[PDB]
Amino acid sequence: MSSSSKLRLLSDLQQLQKDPPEGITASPESENDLYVWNATITGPMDSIWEGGIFFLRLTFPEDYPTKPPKVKFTSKIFHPNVYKDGSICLDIVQDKWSPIYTVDSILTSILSLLEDPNPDSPANPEAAKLFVNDPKEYKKRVRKC
Q1: Are β-strands 70-73 and 33-42 bridged in parallel, bridged antiparallel, or unpaired?
Q2: What are the residue boundaries of the UBC core domain, all occurrences included (predicted)?
Q3: Which structural domain, as residue segments, surrounds residue 18?
Q4: Given 24, 39, 41, 89, which residue is catalytic?
Q5: E strands along 31-135, which residues?
Q6: How far lies 110's CA from each of 6, 13, 29, 78, 91, in Å?
Q7: Which of 1, 17, 47, 110 is the most buried (most CB within 10 A)?
Q8: CB 107 within 8 A of CB 21
């Protein structure tokens, strides 16, 4: 189980280093622990996110990819699917996890959440209600966290 999770994490990193997705970076924090990663994503170049860069922490279980990583924002953010501690409500790293998802797919999915939030799972109900009912105020709260 230890060698298989190491090998899969090595494989996920090799994929990212070969074809890095636009605006996304990710890697182990230290070469001695493949199970704790830092990542950055670049928000859409629109009037809400303004190309802002956000920091994330991914921590992987010992039996990855059978179980998903835990992913959280370490940058502060105002967003319908992000809890106060930065943890993200995203079903593909939760109830809908599948070993088919690499770090690349996970981070690509999280960037999509930024530009297109899911109002159905409001981790942040205030943000969700503004996104749905008052977009000008939503944008205001996004830009001043």
Answers
A1: unpaired
A2: 4-145
A3: 1-145
A4: 89
A5: 33-42, 53-59, 70-73
A6: 23, 17, 20, 14, 11
A7: 110
A8: yes
